[PDB]
């Protein structure tokens, strides 16, 4: 199955998914720590809502590839390089796919003993001072992390070139709602106040309120930066690998990732491409069938480090 | 069509372009160091925001025309003069096009090797007393690098005739959003949720606030000062060269700098011209074809220094 | 229309022109760093800003005519009296029309040898004692420098009658903006060298701040006191000449001084007269045609000294 030729010169891939609630007619947006529901006024003079940020979408698209039941990739993706962190007793604390800021985690790259630290220093020493090459950085990163190449990292740690080394996203997505109405609701924790009726110790009839939103058009947008992955220039095998991996993430999220929140019950009504016009998207079973071959090819080209999975122990 | 009729008709060239966000309805403007988003109140009585600084637009219009990996211009521009800065180990640490201070860059004119310093002093000695001839300076800049002619230079060095010499930029451009509106959305760290929130160790939890804007009209403005370059009087063919170089830079940025921040991604809806009225801008393929011949013509006029490329070594 | 009808009638001529920025809304006003932008509160309580100083508007009105490469007046103004200072080599250091203090300077009337010093002293000896007469000084200036009459002079040298002689400006103009709102901005000087960001040596990142302004009403005022020149009484033909010259200088400044600074790029929209009311100002082509004939007439009266151009050298 050929897909990279149809995406070998186009600068970016745009995909748009039309969502609808599974049951009822309402949904719950993300509770930002300051404002809660981040509603805003649209350019056309109509109310709009950021259903959830372009970060939560990324963390979900990143979880749908991992399996905590084994602390390893799902079988189709098995073999992709990843650093995994163990405690002093050998039980797995965390791995770089679940961490937030990748190799910049405080568990990773910082601790009592640091193998991956000396690896990163040995790799990037030539660029630690002066001009930085995003190709030499992207290859060093792909050596030890197979998906950060889609989400970026900031090597803030001062001893690593003062934090000069940086790399932005290549895949991004978010959900947006048009013409949002509001519904309001609340309740009271009506525990009987016969033995105690003071809220200080949690008794009483304490009330609460919460808001709910109604929108006739919710959209999930996905954007893939083909130009930058070409600008890495690691090889057409790597390019087709990363395109297939991104399509895989999107399909799995779209099929069974749409319970974003307890009251956020969502369904997919139709996916379509926006740019390039007239293209066709692979099916999920076809990506499942292709992925292990493309990963094998890239492993045979030696771009991955060996062993693919690398282990580090965390303690102060 | 040929471009010299415009060099006869008018004193200045004015263009504007309608930008639209590629997806969604909101974007990330520049974060200025002192204040963040540079919003202000408009004379018409409506709020608006400066998307980015005009000198950042200049650095981008320069970036879209040079390849640091190859250490040479894009194919149409090749052969134009430039100075490359060498490291003691022979690897090119930078060049005066990549750097933003052009000849004034502290790595240039400084260190144990300063051949370009004398190549300027040879005529700065004439400029030391009495008046200053802008056409003579513009000639000696065209002799060294045709980009400085386009973006201006200040020769602050005391030995360089007391730092008397300056030249304002002929091409200027900026983007601003009218009637802007605000959409705020913060976030929090996922990782390290279970352990203590000791932010000062780095081993902690951190929430943050983030803000992005909405606008019904974003425009990029481009201004080319024909009067000043004409008042250099270096020729007509050199004027054709500079106007082609500028209009190529515009078209070559209009399809590359469409994204400026990782969350700020736009596309051009249309391009329009203001001064002169009724003129039609040439296509990018036409400039691509014409430009090498104009460069060779001006080289045949003997304006460029020989060799066109200059090498200088920097140590400190 | 002829000029002398209004000169016989009215004591002063008042005109105003309302400006706009050609692109965008912001502009850069004058920047005396001991104050920065000069802002103040108006009579009606509104905030106010003088955009350009009157003395600098005058220096521009005197720099718009004359030509540096031709080293002489523009063709319409050609033939009017002037003095230029030559160096030892023989290339003119200082035309007097360009210089700040006009007929008073360390270059003219000061130096190892000086002819013009005696030429003025002879004509001012009878003004050394008793009351000074404006008519005699105005005659002497009109024979030596026909433009210094409109801008005024102060002969501070104690050798010239203790410096008692002085003459106020006849033409005054300035640019003023009303109901101003500020628009702050900034930037950073980036760097990419290997060793260190020593700002004391010019390396490393260095931020900076700048302030721009906007206004819904900005205009330039012009004032010419016909009473003052009528009080000089050099003649009706001389008055007609000076009125033509002033009008011409304004009508050309309006299409050559708009680019006051690198970031201002103003643009005139309309021009209106305030006193005399009901008058119609001439067009630029008419003054451009008429002016040489009036210079011929006044030369025929013998008011201009012969040779019209005075040559003098300077040596310490």
Author numbering:
A (entry chain F), B (entry chain E), C (entry chain D): 1 to 316
Could you pull the original sentences from the published paper?
Here, we report the composition, structure and function of the type I-G Cascade CRISPR effector from Thioalkalivibrio sulfidiphilus, revealing key new molecular details. The unique Csb2 subunit processes pre-crRNA, remaining bound to the 3′ end of the mature crRNA, and seven Cas7 subunits form the backbone of the effector. Cas3 associates stably with the effector complex via the Cas8g subunit and is important for target DNA recognition. Structural analysis by cryo-Electron Microscopy reveals a strikingly curved backbone conformation with Cas8g spanning the belly of the structure.
For this, the size-exclusion-purified assembled complex containing Cas7, Cas8g and Csb2 in the presence of a 72 nt crRNA was used for the structure determination. Seven interlocking Cas7 subunits which form a crescent shaped structure bound to 42 nt of the crRNA that threads through the interlocking Cas7 subunits were clearly visualised in the CryoEM density. We built the individual Cas7 subunits using the AF2 predicted structure as a starting model. The Cas7 protein adopted the typical central RAMP (Repeat Associated Mysterious Protein) domain with extended β-hairpin region. As observed for other type I complexes, each of the Cas7 subunits occupies 6 nucleotides of the crRNA with a recurring periodic pattern of 5 + 1 nt, with the sixth base flipped out in the opposite direction to the remaining five. A beta hairpin emanating from the adjacent Cas7 subunit is positioned along the phosphate backbone of the sixth base, generating the kink. This structural arrangement creates an unpairing of crRNA and a target DNA at these sites. We can also trace the 5′-handle of the crRNA, which loops back and is not bound by the Cas7.1 subunit. In our CryoEM reconstruction, we did not observe discernible density near the 3′ end of the RNA corresponding to the Csb2 subunit. With seven Cas7 backbone subunits, the type I-G effector shows pronounced curvature of the crRNA, reminiscent of that seen for type I-F systems.
